[PDB]
Design a protein around this ligand. Structure first.
Ligand SMILES: *[C@@H]1O[C@H](CO)[C@@H](O)[C@H](O)[C@H]1NC(C)=O
Ligand SMILES: *[C@@H]1O[C@H](CO)[C@@H](O)[C@H](O)[C@H]1NC(C)=O
Ligand SMILES: *[C@@H]1O[C@H](CO)[C@@H](O)[C@H](O)[C@H]1NC(C)=O
Ligand SMILES: *[C@@H]1O[C@H](CO)[C@@H](O)[C@H](O)[C@H]1NC(C)=O
Lengths: 187, 83
């Protein structure tokens, strides 16, 4: 699976609610069928266990402490997956910004232009998240994972000219997720 | 200058000379990416051209108008920045 973290809370509060969302596996990716999914959490106590999420697409947790790591193992009847995606949460690196600017323009109803300019940083940079949402209705969040090597990508999605949309870019580092950049419209 | 995302209008001016000119070739090339060179034909009777194609307004595009006389190609003319 490819999980995605949703946060619904104030930045001032030290405890944040994190929701995990993943796109259902396809026939080839899961090698066919996976009967049940499991999510494991990493704790400073180093407790090894398993938590069963079910076929439900939503899972919620409350993050308070420093070092937390989540791994979504897709256990099949044969066994468990060997390679999984990875993400970290912590405070100090959530303020550093490496991307100063970005712009978004509409081509038509099928594609959107996004460009960004960033600056070199001491830590290694590998990949980025770009997602979009609608303010007219509080629907589901649509997101995509892109590489940091290429500075230019066209979003292929439906877009209503009348409705006003929100775009945002999340940076990813080994230490965690940095300061998110959210764009409203032309300014 | 681009009228919108799908139309660009170019303008020029000519002066009398001993040689005569027959047609013009409109050529453009991108800066950041090394894309294929696109060229178009135009006669000298009409002074305006409405280039219609898919364009991305954000990036700069380099334009070039070249003249033709009895002896062939003349001095290249380069347009680097949008007006
Ligand atoms: C997170 O997972 C990736 C790949 O699954 C791995 O390369 C990396 O070392 C992991 N990080 C930690 C802190 O376990
Ligand atoms: C929108 O533009 C894209 C190219 O950016 C093109 O593939 C698509 O066909 C266009 N939409 C329509 C409805 O023609
Ligand atoms: C741009 O202008 C040209 C010339 O009138 C027109 O054909 C075209 O429909 C216009 N494009 C848009 C997106 O309005
Ligand atoms: C092409 O050939 C014709 C006849 O040989 C000549 O009149 C014409 O000038 C030539 N074209 C050019 C560009 O010289």
């Amino acid at each position: 699976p490819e999980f995605w973290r949703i946060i619904n809370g104030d930045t001032m509060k030290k405890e944040k609610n994190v929701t995990l969302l993943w796109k259902p596996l396809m026939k080839n990716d899961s090698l066919c069928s996976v009967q049940r999914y499991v999510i494991n959490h990493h704790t400073s106590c180093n407790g090894t266990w398993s938590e069963d999420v079910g076929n439900h697409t939503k899972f919620t947790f409350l993050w308070t402490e420093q070092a937390h790591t989540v791994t979504v193992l897709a256990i099949n009847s044969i066994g468990a997956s060997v390679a999984n995606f990875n993400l970290t949460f912590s405070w100090p690196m959530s303020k550093v910004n490496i991307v100063q600017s970005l712009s978004a323009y509409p081509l038509n109803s099928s594609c959107v232009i996004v460009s960004w300019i960033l600056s070199p940083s001491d830590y290694k940079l590998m990949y980025f998240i770009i997602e979009w949402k609608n303010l007219n209705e509080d629907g589901e969040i649509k997101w995509l994972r892109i590489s940091s090597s290429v500075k230019k990508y066209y979003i292929h999605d439906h877009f209503i000219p009348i409705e006003k949309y929100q775009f945002s870019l999340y940076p990813i580092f080994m230490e965690g997720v940095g300061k998110p950049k959210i764009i409203n419209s032309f300014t």
